[PDB]
């Protein structure tokens, strides 16, 4: 017999890796943990702005299965590496057309793609290597968005067959799951521990993704502030 | 889109429609689901938890001078929805009736408590008979079975009762799409009059905020 469910007071964040985290909160009275876990899990996927490379045109290359003399990687591998780079647009723009150019012997990392329009968050990631008799020139399209947009929908919007359209996975949070574990409070069994596991693609850390989700929850609720 | 407008529409003293907009398509549920749920599990009501009737030891007993036996009196008592006056969480209330009388909710009204549904029937007493009983009324959330109450008060003087505190009879939500397309969350709340729909909704918001507060330690 109570007029209020006990207010949980324990909270922990455990960093499993740079891209994964376990967030635990307890003790909740039975049913209350899940009452909150479900909406926060959903908000984790919708509360952070995402960016992705949507298309690329490589000078001297006709298609995504082509080759380039002077580049160690074939185009397919180049592209696989490019998709592992987590781009971010500098400023408030939704789309940037970025021109790149590299010459001479050169090993290109994420840090080498930082300029006025965009930045690569995982700057230590490798892209490609070119030899001394070569120049790699390409135009990259980076867009803001949410969710998954397949290459076909990109191609249509982009309007230019010289650009190789890319499948785009914009959402920073790739996985978010939870478990409701039983715990005791003052010797009684009717309590729970919420354990959320959050995995991002590296555009932001799991910690920030949860902060954005919690702020978003409060922002929605704030519409009720006036009696 | 994120909600910036709301409206409380009082259809009656026991029914209200609470609307909020705008939400992105498919995002309204993050608010609707938890709040609907808290409208059932965190709203604060009242119920008798135990009763002592003078001359009676058990639920299956009879009482000379009452048409109803004790078990039927209890069944009828369940339909009366009490309210504790003021902010007290508990009241031990003594009632006393005599002579020929039909007892309804309206007759159970004193400084401590009252009954919301005044027209509900409780029992009938015959001439030259008197009914005396003590009722324990409490404030709470959810439902508590007689067995837990029995073990709690540990007192054979009283018969423990199933206590149904929840004052919300129904809480639903509808998500309406508006035709730049957004959605509007509409929650409909019906109470039994122990508290108003607006009060019930404040209980649920307040519970939301307390439960979310543990997650603030992220910063
Ligand atoms: Cl921690
Ligand atoms: Cl549950
Ligand atoms: Cl260079
Ligand atoms: Cl080299
Ligand atoms: Cl080389
Ligand atoms: Cl899950
Ligand atoms: Cl434990
Ligand atoms: Cl009994
Ligand atoms: Cl009387
Ligand atoms: Cl017994
Ligand atoms: Cl519903
Ligand atoms: Cl609906
Ligand atoms: Na080559």
Which keywords apply here?
niaid; 227 residues; alpha+beta; 4 helices; Gyrase A, domain 2; homodimer; Structural Genomics; RNA Polymerase Alpha Subunit, Chain A, domain 2; 2 domains; binds sodium ion; transferase; csgid; Center for Structural Genomics of Infectious Diseases
How would you explain this protein's 3D organization?
The structure is a homodimer. Chain A has 227 residues and is α+β, with helices and mostly antiparallel strands. Chain A is built from 4 helices and 14 strands. The first copy, chain A, is elongated and about 80 Å long. Residues 172-173 of chain B line the site of one chloride ion. The site of one chloride ion has 2 residues of chain A, from strand 1. Chain A: This is DNA-directed RNA polymerase subunit alpha. Chain A: DNA-dependent RNA polymerase catalyzes the transcription of DNA into RNA using the four ribonucleoside triphosphates as substrates. Chain A: It catalyses: RNA(n) + a ribonucleoside 5'-triphosphate = RNA(n+1) + diphosphate. Chain A: Belongs to the RNA polymerase alpha chain family.
């Amino acid at each position: 017999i109570t007029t209020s469910a006990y207010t949980p007071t324990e909270f922990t964040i455990e960093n499993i890796s740079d891209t994964v985290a376990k967030i635990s909160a307890w003790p909740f009275e039975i049913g209350y943990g899940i009452t909150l876990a479900h909406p926060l899990r959903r908000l984790l996927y919708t509360s952070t702005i995402g960016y992705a490379p949507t298309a690329i045109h490589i000078d001297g290359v006709a298609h995504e299965f082509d080759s380039m003399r002077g580049m160690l990687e074939d185009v397919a591998l180049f592209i696989i590496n490019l998709k592992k780079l987590r781009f971010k647009i500098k400023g408030d723009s939704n789309k940037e057309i970025v021109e790149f150019s590299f010459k001479g012997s050169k090993e290109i990392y994420g840090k080498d793609l930082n300029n006025d329009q965009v930045e690569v968050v995982n700057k230590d990631a490798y892209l490609a290597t070119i030899n001394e008799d070569a120049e790699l020139k390409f135009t990259l399209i980076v867009e803001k968005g949410i969710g998954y947009v397949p290459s076909e929908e990109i191609k249509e919007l982009i309007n230019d067959p010289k650009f190789i359209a890319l499948d785009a996975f914009f959402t920073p949070v790739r996985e978010a799951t939870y478990d409701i574990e039983k715990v005791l409070f003052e010797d009684n069994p009717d309590y729970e521990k919420v354990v959320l596991t959050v995995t991002t693609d590296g555009q932001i850390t799991p910690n920030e993704a949860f902060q954005n989700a919690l702020e978003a929850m409060y922002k929605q609720l704030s519409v009720f502030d006036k009696i």
